[PDB]
Design a protein around this ligand. Structure first.
Ligand SMILES: [Zn+2]
Length: 462
RNA sequence: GGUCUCUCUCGU
RNA sequence: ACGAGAGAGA
């Protein structure tokens, strides 16, 4: 991805989009009980903590584009994935507006507790003023679709969250691109059925882990990804995508039977316009973080990417012997013979992709089930039933979460949630957690889940 | 102050 | 089953 131009909102006619500049995050009653190295992200140009110009680090993620036009490797890769998806029998027909707005069995309704985007967010119009879960009223929507149209600009905000200290000094906060409700609606009407399919089939056919539950999914993966694991991280995946990958995606949608009218929506995300404060800017390439389809489209593209990298880097790759699962840029993949990711990354560069070793090390060492992680969790065989696999969220990350809070009103729910993540690390580790929580007055007032009950309830999932 | 997923809680 | 909240992940 690359910024093409920046223009004053005066020159473009766009309304100013201003977001909050102070964090909702405050130290919690456990801040000093547990160790951590994360603080609230920088939200403001003159955060005392800054060591670089803020807006320059913010947008530094747009590293540029290399390829615009799929070569033969990318074409073949897009095709292998497309034929694999055909067995899913995706409904390529347009989903009704009612379903797209208000939900189906396999697609959650448009979030109503969340902004309605450009231009409503400036006009003081919220989603609730247009949509109604009880009515399933589609009439006011179909009016605003024809008042403001489609292809409205993304409203850019800085994401309020914890970031490592390195990331706070270096102004490396994350942006989110608020979608216009109009595009969300239209993207959902066009691809809603493909969302449904993907949500109901996490696994190695979709190649996607969207819709998976780690408590039960982790036991399938060593069976879904047989052979030798390989994995790696991307730096700045979304923003690093060159337009070629959106061309590639158009190939996949076309092949599985999408109409040329529907395939044409992809350029709509490859080429996008954003409002940040008082300026308008145009981005070519890069997935816009906050549009409808972000997870699934990123996951689909990864499926294309891993394939193309394999057959351009190595001789005699059989793509039918590749098994992989993606969740956006997160990947776990397997092949009958070990894959050398040092070489994939070299190829990755030629495609404008920045790939680094999985273990966060600077060498591409071996990846195995003992040290693989996916969605931040590891894989730990149960000591009693080894075919069942614990997803192990590191206590380090759990300690990070518990030290802060956006509203201490909800300390109970927060701590319980963390305990449902933490027990998988084992009885000894969990009780060390719990007793540390008890070591403090608010702690002795919380209801904490019993280890053996957590384990008992986990075993009955099977 | 986005898109989604999963899980928990609280109500009728 | 439906409403409201939260946490985590991408
Ligand atoms: Zn443009």
């Amino acid at each position: 991805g690359e910024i093409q131009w920046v223009k004053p909102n005066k020159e473009t006619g766009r309304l100013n989009i201003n977001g909050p500049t102070r964090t909702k995050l405050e130290p919690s009653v456990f801040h000093d009980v547990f160790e951590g190295n994360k603080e609230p992200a920088v939200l403001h140009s003159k955060d005392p903590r800054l060591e670089v110009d803020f807006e320059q680090a913010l947008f530094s993620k747009y590293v540029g584009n290399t390829l615009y036009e799929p070569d033969e490797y990318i074409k073949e890769a897009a095709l292998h994935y497309a034929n694999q998806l055909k067995q899913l029998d995706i409904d390529t027909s347009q989903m009704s507006m009612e379903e797209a707005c208000y939900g189906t069995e396999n697609l959650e309704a448009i979030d109503l507790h969340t902004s309605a985007g450009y231009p409503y967010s400036a006009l003081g119009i919220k989603k609730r003023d247009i949509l109604d879960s009880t009515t399933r009223d589609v009439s006011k929507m179909k009016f605003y679709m024809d008042k403001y149209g489609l292809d409205l600009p993304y409203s850019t905000y800085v994401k309020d969250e914890l970031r490592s200290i390195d990331k706070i000094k270096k102004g490396k906060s994350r942006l989110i691109e608020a979608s216009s409700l109009n595009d969300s609606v239209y993207l959902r009407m066009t691809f809603g059925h493909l969302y449904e399919t993907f949500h109901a089939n996490p696994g190695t056919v979709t190649g996607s882990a969207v819709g998976c539950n780690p408590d039960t999914f982790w036991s399938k993966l060593p069976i879904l990804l047989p052979g030798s694991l390989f994995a790696f991280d991307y730096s700045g995946y979304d923003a690093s995508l060159s337009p070629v990958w959106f061309r590639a995606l158009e190939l996949v949608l076309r092949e599985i039977g999408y109409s040329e009218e529907a395939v044409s929506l992809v350029e709509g995300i490859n080429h996008t316009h954003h409002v940040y404060r008082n300026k308008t800017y145009c981005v070519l390439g890069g997935m816009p973080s906050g549009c409808s389809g972000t997870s699934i489209f990123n996951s689909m593209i990864n499926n294309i990417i891993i394939r193309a990298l394999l057959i351009k880097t190595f001789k005699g790759i059989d793509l039918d012997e590749l098994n992989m699962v993606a969740y956006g840029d997160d990947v776990l993949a397997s092949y009958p013979f070990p894959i050398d990711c040092l070489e994939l990354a070299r190829t990755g560069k030629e495609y404008g992709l920045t790939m680094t070793p999985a273990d966060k090390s600077p060498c591409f060492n071996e990846v195995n089930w003992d040290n693989a992680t996916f969605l931040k969790r590891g894989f730990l065989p149960d000591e009693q039933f080894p075919f069942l696999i614990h997803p192990t969220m590191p206590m380090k990350e759990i300690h990070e979460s518990i030290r802060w809070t956006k509203d201490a009103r909800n300390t109970q729910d927060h701590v319980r949630s963390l305990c449902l993540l933490a027990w998988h690390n084992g009885k000894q580790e969990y009780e060390k957690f719990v007793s540390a929580i008890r070591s403090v007055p608010v702690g002795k007032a919380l209801a904490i889940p019993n280890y053996e009950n957590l384990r008992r309830n986990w075993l009955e999932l099977f």
